[PDB]
Design a protein around this nucleic acid. Structure first.
Lengths: 114, 177, 66, 78, 79
RNA sequence: CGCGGGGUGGAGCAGCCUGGUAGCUCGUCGGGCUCAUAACCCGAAGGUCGUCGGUUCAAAUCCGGCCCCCGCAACCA
RNA sequence: UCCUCCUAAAGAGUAACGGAGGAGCACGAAGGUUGGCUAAUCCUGGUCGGACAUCAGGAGGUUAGUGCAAUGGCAUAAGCC
RNA sequence: CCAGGGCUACACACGUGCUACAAUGGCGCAUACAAAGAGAAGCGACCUCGCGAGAGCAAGCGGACCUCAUAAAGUGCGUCGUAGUCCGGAUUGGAGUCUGCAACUCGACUCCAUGAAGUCGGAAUCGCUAGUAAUCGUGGAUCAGAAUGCCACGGUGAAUAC
């Protein structure tokens, strides 16, 4: 529909549908449809608009989408500004959770290039 | 039309006691609302500008006036008298209707919306803002657009100060951080 | 407006799910349904969401109890 | 070609003893290039150790304008 | 995310910081207790965590509480 | 002094004649190949187009200046 | 050979292997006309968009333009539609 | 001798392996079938709490008797419709768990979130001829903790040798 932002496809099982909203993995998904008392088996179009509304009515709780981005992105800025070790790593675009920087770690540092 | 009346009523009086205004003419008032999309992608695709026309038209309700370049610039790889964008200088009640059709729905529909700038003003109160995508307006199929072609709209004010202009916008509530 | 150069501008009913049945002109298609409303949008309650930040000592007081 | 072990001399420490303690990672400030002249009141930077800024200079003063409690003095050791 | 119970630091640094508290404003501290985490009374202090070989000041301030001290003391000098 | 021509990747050359994208060769770097180097093989980067100014929307290019290299002339005397 | 200014001594004209620069065309619209409009360059704000696209306002005022070099002229426009 | 740091550093290079690129596949649901081990500051049922990692409880078991521990591919149904897609699982955040004085450097694991490169790899190059290769899961040593490493076990199970 127009849920929160726009995880709005169709002919996609409701759970898999809602996974596409940012900030929501399958866990939260089933937690939603179940809490909204729906059916993960359904295709969004077939789902009553009178239900989809209850889905927004559902997603209101879990922090999500843009708000989430703002929070976490703020958490990172919180760190680089903190001057903390990890903050320094983010500042260097290098692995955080202690890894082998001497070898792989290519994910963080960007694709092999230089 | 509707909130235009709202303007004619509350807004007018409210402001008369706001900026302790004298004559009714002393009140600033919306004038012309323009929509513009400097597509700039037409330089390679002439069939694309039309898509933009369909866009504004969808949001305006009236054929957008296309804009030709005013000067040639290699940095943007364009030449004189060359198409480059679509605009719509709608006014009167139409402008009003576009306004209600605007703030009441599309604005709240802004993805990741938090608030809206209170800063942006021309030095005369005339306001400016930039939408990020065409879908924010209902009428757009959303699914049928071949591309996100955000644009930006400007609202002319008969206001002189940037301040008095803002108060006019505050009359219609109209977001703002 | 010049004749036949503008899309079929027309009234439609903005039936939001929030209750605001505001019927206005546009030029969309048949009619229209919206999730929220300008009347029901948290640009006026999302404020409270924005406020609460910082305060390490407190969450620390949770990770405490002694 | 005549171009530093002095980069390891501050590592040799004893160049400073801030507010009653030595070692403290610090360095020369490019603004008041201190030397054992009229004192030094090193600023405490959030990272990179202390920013010894000679003693009395706008920057050393503007940090006062900010949050001065970060700033402290230092003798010279040797 | 470790030692769920009993946020940890140690007496030598603990007690010494306490002495630094009641004695009001204070001079830099010589701690090797990099592992220790910050606590309320540690706020605003100029404690110097011993780094890879010599101390570096860590002017703890509000936000810097939940973390361990060494986390503000980079050990690997680098390019 | 005069005339003529040229100055582009590390080297040497095209494209400049026609203004809107600087290509080839060797060399260089990475991997391979080999016990090892070469040869061979696969993949890549790399050139403020002498400099200064000018013209144009745009200058390696079109125009002038300067510096450098080079060819011709430098006659009757 | 032809055009523009300087030399040229305030009419014209006025030489040099004097100084500077152009032309050997272009267009059926860039011509005629009626109607209409008027810049450049900047400061401020504005999705992509940045020094430089498009948009809105402000200062400014022909510093713009004028098929092509210079000159004189040009808004009553000759200039732009 | 002691503390802290360091052996985990990272512009890059190579070897060796894990996991994927998906439909003979992922996913939920139901269910069938081993071997070989280890264990006394060790394995620790069942039971209760916790989404879980685990936690409180406390049998049993120094052993064909107890536990670690229900094997997994497989089988049935359902679903997913050839998309970077319910593939992929890195990376990152948040919240935790456990060990051990101690988890920042620098542990493992859980949960919530995120969801990158990859749509079968250039030149080149390796292992393998049988219950081997391939593919799946289990245990053991080392060990508080800490494997895709290694050592061992069984399941499944080919092709081709002119």
């Amino acid at each position: 529909a127009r849920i929160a932002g726009i995880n709005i496809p169709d002919h996609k099982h409701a759970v898999i549908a809602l996974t596409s909203i940012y900030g929501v993995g399958k866990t939260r998904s089933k937690a939603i449809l179940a809490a909204a008392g729906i059916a993960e088996d359904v295709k969004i179009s077939e789902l009553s608009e009178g239900q989809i509304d209850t889905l927004r009515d559902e997603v209101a709780k879990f922090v999500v989408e843009g708000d989430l981005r703002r929070e976490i992105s703020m958490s990172i800025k919180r760190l680089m500004d903190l001057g903390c070790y990890r903050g320094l790593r983010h500042r260097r675009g290098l692995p955080v959770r202690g890894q082998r920087t001497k070898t792989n770690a290519r994910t963080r540092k960007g694709p092999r290039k230089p | 039309a509707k909130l235009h009346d709202y303007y004619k009523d509350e807004v007018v009086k409210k402001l008369m006691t706001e900026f302790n205004y004298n004559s009714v003419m002393q009140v600033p008032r919306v004038e012309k609302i323009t929509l513009n999309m400097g597509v700039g992608e037409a330089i390679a695709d002439k069939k694309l500008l039309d898509n933009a026309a369909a866009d504004l038209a969808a949001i305006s309700g009236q054929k957008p006036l296309i804009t030709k370049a005013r000067k040639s610039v290699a940095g943007f790889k364009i030449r004189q008298g060359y198409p480059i964008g679509c605009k719509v200088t709608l006014r009167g009640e139409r402008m009003w209707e576009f306004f209600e059709r605007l703030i009441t729905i599309a604005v709240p529909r802004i993805r990741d919306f938090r608030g809206l700038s209170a800063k942006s003003f021309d030095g005369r109160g005339n306001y400016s803002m930039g939408v990020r995508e065409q879908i924010i307006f209902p009428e757009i199929d959303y699914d049928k657009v071949d591309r996100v072609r955000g644009l930006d709209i400007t609202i002319t004010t008969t206001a002189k100060s940037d301040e008095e202009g803002r108060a006019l916008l505050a009359a219609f509530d109209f977001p703002f951080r | 407006m010049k004749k036949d150069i503008h899309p079929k501008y027309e009234e439609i009913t903005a039936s939001c799910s929030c209750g605001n049945v505001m019927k206005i002109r546009s030029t969309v298609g048949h009619d229209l349904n919206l999730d929220v409303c300008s009347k029901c949008h948290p640009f006026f309650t999302g404020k409270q969401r924005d406020v609460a930040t910082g305060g390490r000592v407190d969450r620390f007081n949770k990770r405490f109890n002694i | 070609q005549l171009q530093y072990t002095p980069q390891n001399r501050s590592k040799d420490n004893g160049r400073v003893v801030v507010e009653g303690v030595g070692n403290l990672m610090h360095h020369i400030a490019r603004c008041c290039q201190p030397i054992p002249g009229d004192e030094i009141v090193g600023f405490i930077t959030q990272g990179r150790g202390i920013s010894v800024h000679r003693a009395d200079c706008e920057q050393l003063a503007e940090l006062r304008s900010h949050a001065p409690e970060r700033i402290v003095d230092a003798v010279w050791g040797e | 995310r470790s030692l769920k119970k009993g946020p940890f630091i140690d007496l030598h640094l603990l007690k010494k910081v306490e002495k630094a508290v009641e004695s009001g404003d204070k001079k830099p501290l010589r701690t090797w207790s990099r592992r220790s985490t910050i606590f309320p009374n540690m706020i605003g202090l100029t404690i110097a965590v011993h780094n890879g070989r010599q101390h570096v000041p860590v002017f703890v301030t509000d936000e810097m509480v939940g973390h361990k001290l060494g986390e503000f003391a980079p050990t690997r000098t680098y390019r």
